[PDB]
Symmetry: C3
Subunit: 321 residues, 3 copies
């Protein structure tokens, strides 16, 4: 059996990139080894994922690789070099690997994104030498400092980090994945909804300033699409696309594949909500759709079995064999 | 191996109905298609489920079928006609399908249930014409406006919705599934100003007096009271149903309200106690919220498949 | 896509078998806050097999009852209005422990009165009856009954705790002719939020010096829950907890939590590297034994949390367990 769809198939932007949630801020670890990661890359390849982004090379004292710099700063040796593993898997499945910058926790504790520059000066340089120059699949940088609004030190940090990434790698692509300060941006507020969600006009004003400051060293912007309502997608995607076009940046969508509307934070999204978000991205003329996060929220291998079913609904809608 | 039970088996009211959690307020979606739903109806049939209730035909801008009315009001076209699917599956497995009324969100935002009547006037009409007259398994109506206490506009909303349902369908059954304003009707996981049995009886006596001519059954959610309060509340709820000639059902919750994850499948012994209390009180029928997530072998919550096995062992179901 | 056959193990970049192995687990009955898996004897037998494979030799039923819920048909608790359970779990666990040659520890009853008042001395009275009937019904009849778990949990100086632990430990030891007893308190650290005012190492030592002085004659081991402190605070607290155990002649255990306290879901299986770091710290401090809350949910291949089965595989790889 197969459900009879009552909407047109293949009418949205296909997901062609995914984050790899290491080091995760808030998603429980699946305790996968290389065998499980190899199988997930196969599941990704089947649906046409061509890009994998390791979200943050470290988070506070946790790291994804044996960094000589972070080890000297008192961070914890991991048991596996994940950077090496992901680069080898990306090469095996002919995917582009993007390296996420280090997150020290200082910006999260203060609101000043300039705290994140200094450690990344060392991380960027050692990673280029240790991995960038040696692995064919190293194809880009993810500037992992997340914001939604005008933020102290953000333009300066993005400019400094983007410039160093581009200079050392002879111009590999860079991108950011901020979020929209919408009605579901309730983090740290102690309430189920914001009655003071940002207006489209104020969002445009603040992001016009940010893109004016960073576009020479940030190639794409991939807004997280989940903090606004499903009837606000056209309004915000039109503005985000207009801003990307004005500054010559690629306009991506970070199509969240987890559900923000539920009392469990977080399980896989309802397929129709993801479909609506990808259809809106296609209507707005977006260049690429990526997702946070295939392995937990869309994989047949996920511990969240709703993810394997999401994968099947996704394949049916996009007519993927 | 099999555990040695130290209580008598088959000593509670068997579950013979389940909600279908569409459109869900707060349970994460399992992303099932018709294949998975067909298999879940088979798992339901094995344990003697004979009734399936689609809990709410829409919730705010989400809908379960291509409603011409709700689409004109700006609601979202779904990718599958779930009403058509469930009606076909109910007919295939010889079950009765109950249609849950539309939930606009206006009652939840104001506390006045009278806001839910208007959209349902259009929904009941178009659903009777589109489905009720065409599908054999369309067997009843679920009045989805949930309350626990005396509520502004509730008696008149239940009266209006029940009357329209009955009139258009030439008297198909109707029911409500309210909750008890008990210690788990919550900060924290519990509280100290739970409704008394006496005050609950007073308010529901007035509600049943007002609605009994067009509401055939009441299925209180059984989970917001403590397990040692079941006999007291079930005795009152059965006495009120008898007073107004209504059927007395239990909505035996199969998820756990006592845990910090909202929600995973219930501990079997808690469900057993609730079904045993319903049988002691002489209840007509037990339904559950919700088989597919909380008792199914197909659920993403694997504690549900184990619950299904403990349930079959207790009820001696092959 | 199909999983590759064979060994395709991650290349470890840390020394292997460099932490204290987990050789005991709680059995989370009656649970305070972990959703029930609805297992029967078949599933529990299989879980005991998964435990035996990794060298678990001790199983601890965490609390023989909690408020009106109980794990066995207690004549005393039934007279007090508590609920008859459908299975005698004490009988089941004792039979499974004997089958797999493990020691079973009996967790004392938790009435809820201490949780509602902050005074642990309220837990003494019901346990006088529970200890008495359980020794007669089970302790004298089952070979695998090997110890007692004093389930009254604290982290700081607590009203009536020293008196409670002394009374309960003494009755357990007297009735059973000296079987071992232990407690599993927690550290009042930065993750004890159920923070910037976490207890200092100095204040923790001061208070636990007083507690251990009062209870060491009838409490053989202390197994602090290791999860409420940060991973860079393990050496400081474990050094102090070992120093206190040595001063009072007690065994120094670690209750190595196998669930993650850093996540917005309370709780799913821990990240292996976090568990590894906690077991590595216990071994550096010279701890005698590692137990865990809780194998069945958080490390078992049978758990509903499939991250647990993967944790079991990472654990076996690090410890070279076949
Ligand atoms: Na006292």
């Amino acid at each position: 059996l197969e459900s009879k769809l009552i909407v047109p198939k293949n009418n949205g932007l296909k997901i062609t990139g995914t984050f790899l949630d290491e080091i995760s801020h808030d998603i429980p670890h699946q305790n996968w080894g290389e065998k499980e990661w190899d199988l997930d890359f196969q599941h990704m390849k089947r649906i046409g994922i061509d890009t994998v982004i390791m979200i943050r090379s470290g988070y506070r004292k946790f790291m994804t690789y044996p960094s000589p710099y972070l080890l000297k700063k008192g961070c914890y040796m991991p048991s596996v070099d994940l950077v090496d593993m992901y680069l080898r898997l990306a090469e095996k499945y002919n995917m582009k690997f993007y390296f996420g910058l280090y997150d020290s926790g200082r910006y999260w504790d203060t609101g000043d994104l300039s705290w994140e520059i200094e450690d990344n000066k060392y991380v960027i340089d050692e990673v280029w030498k240790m991995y960038g120059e040696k692995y064919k699949s190293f194809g880009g940088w993810y500037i992992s400092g997340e914001i939604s609004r005008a933020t102290k030190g953000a333009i300066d940090a993005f400019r400094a980090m983007g410039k160093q990434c581009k200079d050392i790698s002879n111009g590999l692509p860079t991108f950011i994945s901020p979020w929209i300060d919408g009605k579901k941006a309730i983090m740290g507020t102690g309430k189920l909804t914001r009655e003071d969600a940002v207006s489209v006009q104020q969002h445009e004003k603040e992001w016009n300033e940010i893109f004016d400051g960073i576009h020479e060293v940030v190639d794409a912007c991939a807004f997280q699409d989940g903090h606004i309502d499903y009837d606000e997608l056209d309004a915000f995607f039109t503005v985000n696309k207009k801003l990307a076009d004005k500054y010559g940046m690629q306009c991506w969508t970070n199509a969240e594949s987890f559900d923000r509307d539920m009392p469990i934070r977080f399980l896989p999204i309802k397929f129709d909500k993801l479909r609506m978000k990808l259809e809106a991205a296609k209507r707005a003329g977006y260049d690429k759709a990526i997702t946070f996060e295939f392995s937990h929220f869309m994989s047949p291998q996920s511990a969240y079995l709703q993810a394997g079913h999401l994968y099947d609904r996704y394949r049916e809608y996009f007519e993927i064999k």
